[PDB]
Every structure is written in structure tokens, then in C-alpha cells.
Amino acid sequence: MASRILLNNGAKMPILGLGTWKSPPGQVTEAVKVAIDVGYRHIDCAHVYQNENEVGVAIQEKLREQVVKREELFIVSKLWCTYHEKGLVKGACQKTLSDLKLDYLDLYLIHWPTGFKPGKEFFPLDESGNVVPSDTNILDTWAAMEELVDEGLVKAIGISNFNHLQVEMILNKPGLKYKPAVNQIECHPYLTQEKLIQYCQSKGIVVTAYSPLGSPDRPWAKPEDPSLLEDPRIKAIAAKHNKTTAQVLIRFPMQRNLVVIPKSVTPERIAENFKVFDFELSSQDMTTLLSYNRNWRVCALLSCTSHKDYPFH
Ligand SMILES: NC(=O)C1=CN([C@@H]2O[C@H](COP(=O)(O)OP(=O)(O)OC[C@H]3O[C@@H](n4cnc5c(N)ncnc54)[C@H](OP(=O)(O)O)[C@@H]3O)[C@@H](O)[C@H]2O)C=CC1
Ligand SMILES: O=C(O)COc1cc(F)ccc1C(=S)NCc1ccc(Br)cc1F
């Protein structure tokens, strides 16, 4: 398979990227260096992950070393929920740029549709534990994202964790200037997302699949939860193809015309996860993997469920 997918801004995006949520700051610089050395050209970042400075050290070193040129990298970050007001978006983007050692981002996403009260805390809570909303709305946050394109800070803008009605809301915005290029959503065999994916794809929006391995390192994991990497049925497909279960889980979204962003800080796994362009899942394999859907989510958060714009039900 071809390495890149065409976006509706006319740029090409690598279909495989390195995830960085939970990558410890003392490990992520090496992880990104190794990733670039073994062929990765897309890194998925976010301010809320608290490691963009260290990601940036790696990017800058590999550019300085001339392992890669900047035009060949595709760096993605995301606007956190406490920065949805008009007067905060540009500074949030610029902080990310400064940390990542970048003059521009290839793609900047609204991380979640929900705006929260600005301040130091990423999840401001009331005394009963509910997130404190801001009275920002999706559409005005989108207008702020559009300004970043028009200032040269970002090449593409998109959304993340937007449901069907929220994507539609963005597409139907009065005076819409730039369509979202990407909707980044959780997607794997236990949360196959057929409905949302077809809607977005039909609208020319590329979907990126996050937590493709089921995020085994998620901090809220419980022992009872299903485990993709350990599922007998997925292991059998991997065995048949002489690949690892992770490699199957990465190739699966690729064949659905998705971008996929597995995270690792383990050098051997960073390389393993890139070796997914030399085998094909059959249509029967694809349908079989799709059949494992159970509407099971890594990423959800009880404290945010009453926000007017919380995306999931
Ligand atoms: N937009 C959003 O709201 C969200 C975005 N994301 C993005 O998506 C990325 C990926 O999702 P994430 O939730 O991190 O989880 P993943 O599904 O990518 O799973 C990461 C875990 O899998 C392990 N792992 C990686 N490769 C292998 C392998 N070959 N064999 C076995 N285990 C392996 C990692 O271990 P180790 O690192 O120890 O090797 C880590 O524990 C995030 O890092 C982030 O960039 C994720 C959630 C939400
Ligand atoms: O969010 C990520 O990329 C990965 O996860 C996170 C990454 C972080 F660095 C900090 C918190 C999260 C959480 S708890 N994310 C879930 C979450 C946050 C906000 C809302 Br609205 C709903 C929700 F489900």
C-alpha cells in the first residue's frame, strides 16, 4: 500500500503515524528518533499529553541531522478543551509550535468538541466533580481554527471525537471557509465505527483511528475489559498471515482507507508496527475483524458527560 492519503486541503498525509499519549517524557525523544529512523513520517501529538517539548527535541534533532526534511514530516497536534475561546486559540497553537520546534503544523485538531473553563487545570471541576464548561460553541471554535490556516500557522485543520451531528454542524456552518480535513476518532475491532466512518468519508473527511491496539496502557484499564492484543480470534488471523496481532490491528484500519496512529515507546515495537505495508488482509479477514464490534470505548470520561457537547452516548 501507498504510504499517504490525499486530504481535502490538497496535502498528503502518511497513513501510519506514531502515537505519543502516555509516552513518558524521558522516553519519548528516543521513541520519536527511532520512529523517524525506521520510516515514520507522521507523529500524533497534543498539548494535553504534556510531552510536546520532548517530542520536539527529537523532531529538531532529526531535521538537524538531515535524516528527513521538514516537508517530508507530517506533525499533528490538538487544541485542548480549556482553550476553545477566540482569544486563546492562537496562543495555544503557538505554545504547541514552540514546544515541537516547528514553524507550522501539518494538521491541528479540535481535541474534543467540549470547551472547558480556561485556567491552569486541564479538567476544571465543580465541587461535585462535574467539568466546568465554557460557553463556547463548536462553530466559533472552528472559525478560530480557520484563522490559524489564514495566518500560516497550520496547513490543515480538523476535529477529533466529533459525532455525526457535530461533524454535520461543522459542515453546515454559515460562512464555512475550510472544511475539516480529518476527524480523529477511536477505532478498532471492538469499536468499528462503521456509521461515523462512512458519513465522514462520504463528506471527503479523512478518518484517523486512535487507540488501534485498544490502549492497553490506558490509566483506567481494568482486568475484566476485553483485550484486542490477546483475543484468540485476532491472534489466529495474525498467525495465518505470519504477522503479529499488533500488525493485523494496524493493517485493518489502513485497508478501510483510515489513517492509524499506534503508540509505542519500545524500539522493537515501533519498528514492528511500521512493517505493515507488505501484506494484505482478505475481504473475509476484514469482515471477520469487523464482526468483533462490541461498541467498547477506551476513551470516555464520566466527569464530562453532562457537558452540552459531550459526544458519546
Ligand atoms: N484524539 C484523541 O482523543 C485521542 C488520541 N489518541 C492518539 O492515538 C495514539 C494511540 O492510542 P493509545 O490510546 O496510545 O493506544 P494504542 O492502541 O496505540 O496502544 C498503545 C499500547 O500498546 C502497546 N503496544 C504498541 N505496539 C505494540 C506491539 N507491537 N505489541 C504489543 N503491544 C504494543 C504500547 O506499549 P509500549 O509503548 O510499552 O511499547 C502501549 O501500551 C495515542 O498515543 C494518541 O497519540 C489516543 C486516544 C485519544
Ligand atoms: O484525550 C486523549 O487524547 C487521551 O486521553 C487523555 C489524555 C490526557 F493527556 C489527559 C486526559 C485524557 C482523557 S481522560 N481523555 C478522555 C476524555 C477527555 C475529554 C473528554 Br470531553 C472526554 C474524554 F473521554
Tab-separated table of C-alpha atoms in Angstrom, residues 105-261:
chain	number	residue	atom	x	y	z
A	105	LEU	CA	1.778	22.204	11.969
A	106	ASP	CA	0.645	19.919	9.174
A	107	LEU	CA	-2.678	19.346	10.965
A	108	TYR	CA	-4.249	20.944	14.027
A	109	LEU	CA	-7.342	19.348	15.553
A	110	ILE	CA	-10.051	20.449	17.978
A	111	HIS	CA	-9.158	17.707	20.503
A	112	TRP	CA	-12.678	17.234	21.881
A	113	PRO	CA	-15.861	19.107	20.897
A	114	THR	CA	-16.351	20.355	24.505
A	115	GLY	CA	-14.955	23.665	25.734
A	116	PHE	CA	-13.976	23.944	29.406
A	117	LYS	CA	-13.341	26.961	31.626
A	118	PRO	CA	-9.890	28.425	30.893
A	119	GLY	CA	-7.240	28.214	33.524
A	120	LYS	CA	-4.271	26.158	34.643
A	121	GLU	CA	-6.233	22.931	35.160
A	122	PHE	CA	-6.905	20.819	32.087
A	123	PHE	CA	-10.115	19.473	33.685
A	124	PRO	CA	-11.605	22.267	35.855
A	125	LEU	CA	-14.203	20.681	38.139
A	126	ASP	CA	-17.014	21.947	40.316
A	127	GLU	CA	-17.236	20.761	43.925
A	128	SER	CA	-19.221	17.702	42.823
A	129	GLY	CA	-16.756	16.609	40.193
A	130	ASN	CA	-18.520	17.805	37.046
A	131	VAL	CA	-16.351	19.535	34.445
A	132	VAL	CA	-16.935	23.290	34.300
A	133	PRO	CA	-17.970	24.174	30.724
A	134	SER	CA	-17.145	27.272	28.832
A	135	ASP	CA	-19.979	28.846	26.873
A	136	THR	CA	-18.047	28.365	23.681
A	137	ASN	CA	-19.614	26.720	20.802
A	138	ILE	CA	-18.216	24.453	18.248
A	139	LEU	CA	-18.736	26.798	15.314
A	140	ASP	CA	-16.924	29.734	16.791
A	141	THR	CA	-14.033	27.443	17.805
A	142	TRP	CA	-13.939	26.297	14.165
A	143	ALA	CA	-13.754	29.900	12.967
A	144	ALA	CA	-10.747	30.345	15.244
A	145	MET	CA	-9.140	27.244	13.684
A	146	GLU	CA	-9.768	28.697	10.199
A	147	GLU	CA	-7.846	31.830	11.222
A	148	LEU	CA	-4.799	29.685	12.004
A	149	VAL	CA	-4.774	28.451	8.383
A	150	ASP	CA	-5.038	32.060	7.195
A	151	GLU	CA	-2.061	33.049	9.380
A	152	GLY	CA	0.191	30.283	8.105
A	153	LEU	CA	0.484	28.520	11.477
A	154	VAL	CA	-1.190	25.292	10.294
A	155	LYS	CA	-1.552	23.681	6.870
A	156	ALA	CA	-4.754	21.770	7.691
A	157	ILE	CA	-7.382	21.864	10.416
A	158	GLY	CA	-9.654	19.137	11.671
A	159	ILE	CA	-11.648	17.698	14.530
A	160	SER	CA	-11.420	14.826	16.983
A	161	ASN	CA	-14.082	12.892	18.868
A	162	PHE	CA	-16.826	14.675	16.923
A	163	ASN	CA	-20.014	12.682	16.481
A	164	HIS	CA	-22.072	12.593	13.330
A	165	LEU	CA	-24.226	15.586	14.286
A	166	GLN	CA	-21.207	17.622	15.335
A	167	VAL	CA	-19.405	16.937	12.025
A	168	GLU	CA	-22.617	17.938	10.253
A	169	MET	CA	-22.777	21.035	12.399
A	170	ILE	CA	-19.274	21.960	11.195
A	171	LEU	CA	-20.144	21.206	7.521
A	172	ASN	CA	-23.353	23.283	7.709
A	173	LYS	CA	-21.655	26.270	9.446
A	174	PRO	CA	-22.784	29.596	7.953
A	175	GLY	CA	-19.877	31.067	6.088
A	176	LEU	CA	-17.728	27.895	6.401
A	177	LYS	CA	-14.315	28.687	4.912
A	178	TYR	CA	-12.389	25.426	5.293
A	179	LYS	CA	-13.940	22.000	5.738
A	180	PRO	CA	-12.359	19.774	8.381
A	181	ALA	CA	-9.640	17.684	6.758
A	182	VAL	CA	-9.707	14.905	9.377
A	183	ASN	CA	-11.884	13.533	12.159
A	184	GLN	CA	-9.672	11.558	14.576
A	185	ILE	CA	-11.766	9.001	16.495
A	186	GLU	CA	-11.285	5.825	18.481
A	187	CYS	CA	-11.476	2.824	16.145
A	188	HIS	CA	-10.524	-0.835	16.445
A	189	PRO	CA	-12.296	-4.231	16.104
A	190	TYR	CA	-14.278	-3.677	19.329
A	191	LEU	CA	-15.438	-0.174	18.196
A	192	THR	CA	-15.595	-0.411	14.450
A	193	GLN	CA	-17.334	2.921	13.810
A	194	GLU	CA	-18.934	1.930	10.536
A	195	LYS	CA	-21.628	4.623	10.636
A	196	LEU	CA	-19.416	7.553	11.552
A	197	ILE	CA	-16.666	6.488	9.162
A	198	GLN	CA	-18.972	6.217	6.115
A	199	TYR	CA	-20.513	9.631	6.983
A	200	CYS	CA	-17.109	11.313	7.215
A	201	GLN	CA	-15.662	9.549	4.191
A	202	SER	CA	-18.761	10.453	2.119
A	203	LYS	CA	-18.054	14.048	3.011
A	204	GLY	CA	-14.327	13.862	1.949
A	205	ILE	CA	-13.134	13.966	5.581
A	206	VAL	CA	-10.287	11.514	6.286
A	207	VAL	CA	-10.706	9.484	9.456
A	208	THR	CA	-7.769	8.730	11.753
A	209	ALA	CA	-8.156	5.712	14.039
A	210	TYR	CA	-6.775	6.213	17.532
A	211	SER	CA	-6.211	3.515	20.174
A	212	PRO	CA	-5.981	0.904	17.366
A	213	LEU	CA	-4.475	-1.653	19.751
A	214	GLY	CA	-7.112	-0.963	22.407
A	215	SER	CA	-4.843	1.268	24.504
A	216	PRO	CA	-3.678	-1.454	26.932
A	217	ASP	CA	-1.758	1.193	28.900
A	218	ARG	CA	-4.785	3.452	29.390
A	219	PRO	CA	-4.671	4.529	33.099
A	220	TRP	CA	-8.246	3.365	33.779
A	221	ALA	CA	-7.782	-0.144	32.375
A	222	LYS	CA	-9.446	-2.907	34.420
A	223	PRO	CA	-8.568	-6.619	34.325
A	224	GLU	CA	-12.153	-7.539	33.136
A	225	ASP	CA	-12.024	-5.338	29.970
A	226	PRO	CA	-11.735	-7.046	26.503
A	227	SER	CA	-8.146	-7.215	25.146
A	228	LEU	CA	-7.587	-6.971	21.408
A	229	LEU	CA	-3.997	-7.963	21.525
A	230	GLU	CA	-4.901	-11.148	23.451
A	231	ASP	CA	-8.083	-12.036	21.526
A	232	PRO	CA	-7.796	-15.606	20.251
A	233	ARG	CA	-9.674	-14.800	17.105
A	234	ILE	CA	-7.339	-11.925	16.117
A	235	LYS	CA	-4.274	-13.940	17.026
A	236	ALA	CA	-5.490	-16.610	14.582
A	237	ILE	CA	-5.700	-14.126	11.690
A	238	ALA	CA	-2.209	-12.879	12.577
A	239	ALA	CA	-0.856	-16.439	12.667
A	240	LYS	CA	-2.348	-17.209	9.279
A	241	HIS	CA	-0.519	-14.179	7.796
A	242	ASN	CA	2.714	-14.810	9.751
A	243	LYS	CA	2.334	-11.354	11.352
A	244	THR	CA	1.858	-10.151	14.917
A	245	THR	CA	-1.558	-9.346	16.327
A	246	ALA	CA	-0.498	-5.675	16.534
A	247	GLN	CA	0.427	-5.730	12.830
A	248	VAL	CA	-3.052	-7.071	11.978
A	249	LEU	CA	-4.647	-4.398	14.191
A	250	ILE	CA	-2.666	-1.693	12.326
A	251	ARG	CA	-3.253	-3.053	8.801
A	252	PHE	CA	-7.012	-3.363	9.478
A	253	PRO	CA	-7.770	0.410	9.542
A	254	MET	CA	-5.324	1.017	6.693
A	255	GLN	CA	-7.474	-1.167	4.421
A	256	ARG	CA	-10.557	0.842	5.431
A	257	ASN	CA	-8.874	3.990	3.994
A	258	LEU	CA	-8.126	5.207	7.526
A	259	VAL	CA	-5.002	6.743	8.969
A	260	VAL	CA	-3.795	4.896	12.095
A	261	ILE	CA	-1.563	6.074	14.957
